[PDB]
Amino acid sequence: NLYFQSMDPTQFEERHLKFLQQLGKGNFGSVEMCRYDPLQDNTGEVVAVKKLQHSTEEHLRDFEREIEILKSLQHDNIVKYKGVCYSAGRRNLKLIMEYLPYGSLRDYLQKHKERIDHIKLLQYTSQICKGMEYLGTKRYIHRDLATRNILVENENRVKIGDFGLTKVLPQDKEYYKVKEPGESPIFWYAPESLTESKFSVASDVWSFGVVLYELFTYIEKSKSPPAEFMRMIGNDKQGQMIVFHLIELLKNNGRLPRPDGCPDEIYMIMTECWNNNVNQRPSFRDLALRVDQIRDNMAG
Ligand SMILES: C[C@H](Nc1cc(-c2cnn(C)c2)cc(Nc2cnccn2)n1)c1ccc(F)cc1
């Protein structure tokens, strides 16, 4: 009560944060490109600014937690936190980050195939794994690992880009049980997340297996995880029937197919991530080493 937590409300003053572009509407969030020009000279750093879409009390509280999570992370493959802008005369909150100029990995794969080959896909795979190793050291569970939530800095570097669903493990448990779910990315969820709302490092590994699938499908039309799972379950199914069939399919070893052109060894990594036995999934450290060994064992 007596002394409120630190903040730094002068680092990004709203009057000096200049709009450049709308980047996208995620899920209950909106991201802008802005320039922070404290000298009012038309210069300054370009930044990304994440804002809420629906400013309810619950969302503002969750957003503060998300900001604290991102501020606690410093790693080459995690988007860089810069600060907060307490706009509307210090009656609102906006998250300030570095700006990564190629956008989401999902869109980059679809729009920039001219500059993507398997070597790059393996580099991105390795980088995502390393970002996730780092999250695990903080006991953070991402819960939404998907190419749409990874950002592309340049042809040689990706970073995990959004943390809107990330949770902190309890001190005494190796999973977080989510007890008020919002919208759920079911086609990236491990079976125990679908059936028990349990999220862990191991369920992030399951989702990483879906990310790896995404990379090698080159986000081809009809090849996305939702499209392929719906083809397998039945395209006409709606509502909860989708979830019932997805669970039954996964529990009995139904899986996304090997993408066209995907090496057998890379599909093997996918299938090992997609183990119904949580403890038998590889760690992110195992995966980073294996991927980097594959890369390093190539000629040259
Ligand atoms: C919604 C936002 N969309 C978006 C689009 C583009 C873009 C499009 N086209 N081009 C040439 C660039 C750039 C950025 N950059 C950012 C965003 N947040 C922080 C740092 N950088 N974000 C986003 C996407 C994925 C993700 F994981 C986090 C945010």
Author numbering: 833 to 1132
Q: Which of the paper's sentences describe this entry?
A:
Janus kinase (JAK) family of nonreceptor tyrosine kinases consists of JAK1–3 and TYK2 (tyrosine kinase 2) that serve as triggering kinases for cellular signaling of over 50 cytokines and hormones in regulation of blood and immune cells and metabolism. JAK2 activity is crucial for hematopoietic signaling particularly in homomeric myeloid, and hormone receptors and activating mutations of JAK2 have been identified in multiple malignancies, most notably Philadelphia chromosome-negative myeloproliferative neoplasms (MPNs), where mutated JAK2 drives the disease manifestations. MPNs are clonal neoplastic diseases initiated in the bone marrow from a mutated hematopoietic stem cell. All of these compounds are type-I inhibitors that target the conserved active conformation of the adenosine 5′-triphosphate (ATP)-binding pocket of the kinase domain and show variable target selectivity and differences in clinical profiles. Structural analysis showed that all compounds anchor to the ATP-pocket of the kinase domain of JAK2 by making two or three hydrogen bonds with the hinge region.
In a more open G-loop conformation induced by JAK2-selective ilginatinib and momelotinib, the Asn859-Asp994 interaction is broken. Both compounds form hydrogen bonds to backbone carbonyl and amide of Leu932 at the hinge region and make one additional hydrogen bond outside the hinge, ilginatinib with Leu855 from the β1-strand and momelotinib with Asp994 from the DFG motif. The structural determinant, which aligns with JAK2 selectivity, is a G-loop conformation where Asn859 from the G-loop and Asp994 from the DFG motif are not in the hydrogen-bonding distance. This occurs in JAK2-selective ilginatinib, momelotinib, and fedratinib, which bind the G-loop in an open conformation and also in pacritinib, where the G-loop is collapsed. The compounds also inhibited the catalytic activity of JAK2 in vitro with low-nanomolar IC50 values, and the most potent inhibition was observed by ilginatinib, lestaurtinib, and ruxolitinib. The highest JAK2 selectivity over JAK1 was demonstrated for pacritinib (26-fold selectivity over JAK1), momelotinib (13-fold), AT9283 (9-fold), ilginatinib (9-fold), and fedratinib (6-fold). The binding of momelotinib, ilginatinib, cerdulatinib, and lestaurtinib is mainly driven by enthalpy. Gandotinib, itacitinib, and ilginatinib take advantage of this as the compounds clash with the alanine in JAK3.
